[PDB]
Amino acid sequence: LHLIPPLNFSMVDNGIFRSGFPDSANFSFLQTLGLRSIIYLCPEPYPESNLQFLKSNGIRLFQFGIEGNKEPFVNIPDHKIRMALKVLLDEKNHPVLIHSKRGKHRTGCLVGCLRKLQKWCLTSIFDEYQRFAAAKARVSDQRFMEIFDVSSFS
Numbered sequence: 830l831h832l833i834p835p836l837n838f839s840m841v842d843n844g845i846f847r848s849g850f851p852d853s854a855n856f857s858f859l860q861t862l863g864l865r866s867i868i869y870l871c872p873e874p875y876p877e878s879n880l881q882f883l884k885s886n887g888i889r890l891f892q893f894g895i896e897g898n899k900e901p902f903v904n905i906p907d908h909k910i911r912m913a914l915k916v917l918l919d920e921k922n923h924p925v926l927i928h929s930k931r932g933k934h935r936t937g938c939l940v941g942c943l944r945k946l947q948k949w950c951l952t953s954i955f956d957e958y959q960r961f962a963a964a965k966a967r968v969s970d971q972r973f974m975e976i977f978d979v980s981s982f983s
């Protein structure tokens with residue numbers, strides 16, 4: 830036994846994964862996925878360790894830096910989520926890992942908006958969001974998904 834998936838790692842769909850921030854202990858696991866792409870949702874620069882892993886493995890980094898904010902005073906990062914969705918929906922970028930810091934809020938919102946495009950009823954989207962967010966589930970994240978207009982992606 831030796832592979833360590835990154836924090837809160839899960840398969841979302843064919844060619845799509847979610848997690849928190851990978852560190853060097855996770856690189857041997859991430860190698861088994863044959864990633865083409867990472868969608869990174871934090872504003873902080875990528876560490877040198879991570880950049881060397883991407884360069885060694887031919888993985889493209891897409892960064893859409895969403896500022897972390899806590900309830901009750903939240904950002905509505907609509908443009909950044911939609912830019913990340915545009916990349917996520919292009920199969921040429923697959924396999925793709927979506928990650929933020931812990932993979933609960935920013936990652937959860939992007940995945941929830943994907944589920945809405947996949948025609949999941951809201952309660953099913955929120956159940957999946959809650960499974961990762963656990964005691965840190967935010968009503969604001971779920972309201973963002975409730976309000977999200979799918980029009981431009983149909």
Ligand SMILES: O=P(O)(O)O[C@H]1[C@@H](OP(=O)(O)O)[C@@H](OP(=O)(O)O)[C@H](OP(=O)(O)OP(=O)(O)O)[C@@H](OP(=O)(O)O)[C@@H]1OP(=O)(O)O
Nearest residue numbers: 849871896897898899928929930931932933934935936965
């Ligand atoms: O209370 P805070 O000091 O603001 O801690 C919170 C932390 O919450 P706690 O550690 O106190 O529980 C959140 O973590 P979770 O709520 O996910 O447990 C985490 O946001 P997060 O890493 O969740 O961001 P996502 O990556 O899920 O968007 C926050 O990160 P952000 O600031 O959103 O990048 C803070 O973590 P940092 O300390 O690393 O900034």
Ligand SMILES: O=P(O)(O)O[C@H]1[C@H](OP(=O)(O)O)[C@@H](OP(=O)(O)O)[C@H](OP(=O)(O)O)[C@@H](OP(=O)(O)O)[C@H]1OP(=O)(O)O
Nearest residue numbers: 872893894895896897898903904905906907908909910912
């Ligand atoms: O520059 P603007 O045209 O006013 O648009 C901004 C801008 O959105 P994008 O840059 O992502 O297009 C903010 O992000 P920064 O430029 O500051 O990085 C964003 O903030 P978040 O990314 O945190 O959402 C904000 O959205 P909001 O104010 O709703 O949180 C949004 O403004 P509209 O919301 O486009 O005025």
